[PDB]
């Protein structure tokens, strides 16, 4: 019925560990590409199926290894994930958006045969950490074909984005680098009221929560991508009528629940 549906019926427990697909990696060298610093592609293996694609950006000073756990996690749940390195560690959020744009184009047009065979290039999304999350919001404004955006503890000087791309923002309660009051919450509040949007705030979490295995980030990221990239309504249960003790805040216009 849903040709994009992958994997067994989800449980919260299954979404806090690597999923039902084996994962292969492909290293994209900085020299092989223009518009971004290369990175790592996590993609399903031991399968003939195709999956949606995600381009993901790390934050200021950081490299692709800072989101390796999440690239592998998503890939293992049935996604093709390119975690980029940036041209410079010190690139800002709009530069990161440009590099996500180049990464998506690369994934679609120039990625290895091994990756394209597993990729449905009609079904793409973006995610990013901190300045990477800022980049995610910018590219969401520019590219209306994207299925979803997930900014993780995002940072941007721009507080105002216009997109119809569904957005789930993860804030960290104890974030002193991109405080939720100045970044995540303004981004959420200033998105259009007609766009499906969710904001989740992790209790006691720091700016670096997204850089290490994290159950809540795994659940909300997989669930948002599954719902929008795969049209997978089985993931509504994790994003609707939410009563999660890991969270210290939750805001939504509940446009994703029906
Ligand atoms: O000091 C800052 O203003 C500042 C520092 C760092 C970042 C960022 O993207 O953080 C995560 C890096 O992995 C953003 C702003
Ligand atoms: Ca703006």
UniProtKB/Swiss-Prot annotation:
Reaction(s) the record says it catalyses: cutin + H2O = cutin monomers; (ethylene terephthalate)(n) + H2O = (ethylene terephthalate)(n-1) + 4-[(2-hydroxyethoxy)carbonyl]benzoate + H(+); 4-[(2-hydroxyethoxy)carbonyl]benzoate + H2O = terephthalate + ethylene glycol + H(+); an acetyl ester + H2O = an aliphatic alcohol + acetate + H(+)
Mechanisms controlling activity: Is inhibited in vitro by diethyl pNP-phosphate (E600), but not by EDTA.
Keyword line: Disulfide bond, Hydrolase, Secreted, Serine esterase, Signal
Modification after translation (UniProt): The disulfide bond between Cys-240 and Cys-257 contributes not only to the thermodynamic stability but also to the kinetic stability of the enzyme.
Subcellular location as annotated: Secreted
Entry keyword Disulfide bond: yes
Protein name: Leaf-branch compost cutinase
Domain of life the protein comes from: Bacteria
Residues at the catalytic site: 130, 175, 207
GO CC annotations, alphabetized: extracellular region
Biotechnological exploitation: The engineered enzyme with mutations Ile-208/Cys-203/Cys-248/Gly-92 can hydrolyze PET in a highly efficient way, ultimately achieving, in less than 10 hours, a minimum of 90 per cent PET depolymerization into monomers, with a productivity of 16.7 grams of terephthalate per liter per hour. It was also shown that biologically recycled PET produced from enzymatically depolymerized PET waste exhibits the same properties as petrochemical PET, before being processed into bottles, thereby contributing towards the concept of a circular PET economy.
Listed GO MF terms: acetylesterase activity; cutinase activity
Pfam families given in the database record: PETase
Entry note: thermal dependence: Optimum temperature is 50 degrees Celsius with pNP-butanoate as substrate. Optimum temperature using PET as substrate is superior to 70 degrees Celsius. Shows 70% of the maximal activity at 30 and 70 degrees Celsius with pNP-butyrate as substrate. Has half-lives of 5 hours at 50 degrees Celsius, 80 minutes at 60 degrees Celsius, 40 minutes at 70 degrees Celsius and 7 minutes at 80 degrees Celsius. Is thermostable, with a determined melting temperature (Tm) of 84.7 degrees Celsius.
EC number, UniProt record: 3.1.1.74, 3.1.1.101
